[PDB]
Amino acid sequence: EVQLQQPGPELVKPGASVKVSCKASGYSFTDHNMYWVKQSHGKSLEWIGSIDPYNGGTRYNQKFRGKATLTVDKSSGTAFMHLNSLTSEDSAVYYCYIGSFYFVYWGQGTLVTVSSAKTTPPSVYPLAPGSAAQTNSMVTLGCLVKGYFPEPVTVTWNSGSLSSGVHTFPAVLQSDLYTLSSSVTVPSSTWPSETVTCNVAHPASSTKVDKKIVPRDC
């Protein structure tokens, strides 16, 4: 089945370049043009350009000419978008996608952050109720994911098998560091008697942490 796999997030210094890839499978590669699209935080979408794997021809949005260069490597079915002279204006999710009358398929996008600030792994802190407890109710637990750069982190609960009751809040940026929290709500009869664990992944620093929530010690 059709897949467009794009790599994970990129942090780049101002003035540098980045090359984002889009690996295609599950269909005949030359059947479809590959479109590239920019989504900046809270702005709309911008078509960057397209490339046609059949003949290698390219078409560019004039606003991106001189800045984006589209190539394909047919031997691995991979399209590439090279972006030079990067500034913070270029921080965005970059997408590749294909389409026809019959379907449209987008890749998951590659977040590119253009910043001078350094990568910093998160500190992960369990949030457990202060000695208060309750009977026959719900209990809300949490995880504080503090002091990291760049975005994103991913947070799951019990490796993602706890789904309902979960709120993961958008990170806040302060002085070159992000902080977010996540809460989970489970019946009081299931915790602390059954384990609840917060899983935090920070791909930019290759950080993976599991923080079990344990009752506060008085």
Next chain:
Amino acid sequence: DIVMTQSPKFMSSSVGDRVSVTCKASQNVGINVAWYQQKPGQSPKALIHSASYRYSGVPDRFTGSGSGTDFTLTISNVQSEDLADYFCQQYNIYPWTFGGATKLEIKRADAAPTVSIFPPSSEQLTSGGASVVCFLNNFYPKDINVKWKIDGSERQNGVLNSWTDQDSKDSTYSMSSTLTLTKDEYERHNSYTCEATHKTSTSPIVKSFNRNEC
């Protein structure tokens, strides 16, 4: 370049109501207009091509109309899962261009926030910092205020707040509030209070702990 001007920017609808989003092109684009839905943290999903052709797998509650410059996406019998951004795109002429997103909120009965307060973890205390977290979960409508008190005194510096997108299941909102202090300031005071003020009540929901106190 064709400019696609979308309206309204925000729309609010009860389940079962009929919503419509309009998309006005600055020049004629025939019928080469598509409509997209994008839920938070997800890639865009095509709904409609050629202004009125629904894609395979899209519910029949989604319809498109219009030609030339005026285009309209209609959602009949709106469902809570339809909460998303929506936007149009013209692909009649290069460069292809997109309208700005319309955010659809689904209406629901008012709910008071569920408030919980959490003291700093011991592992954060060992590193010389102290963050106090308060969750205000699953409330409607989206407006809400939170106040911190330290030993009964209002505390305004050092607070950072964050708000979720509308919940896909129960159509509510949540907010997190974090008060961050040095370990020293945290250990110079005893009482820590989170207060939530929401239209569901004229009385704040108060939540507290003392730095001692089994």
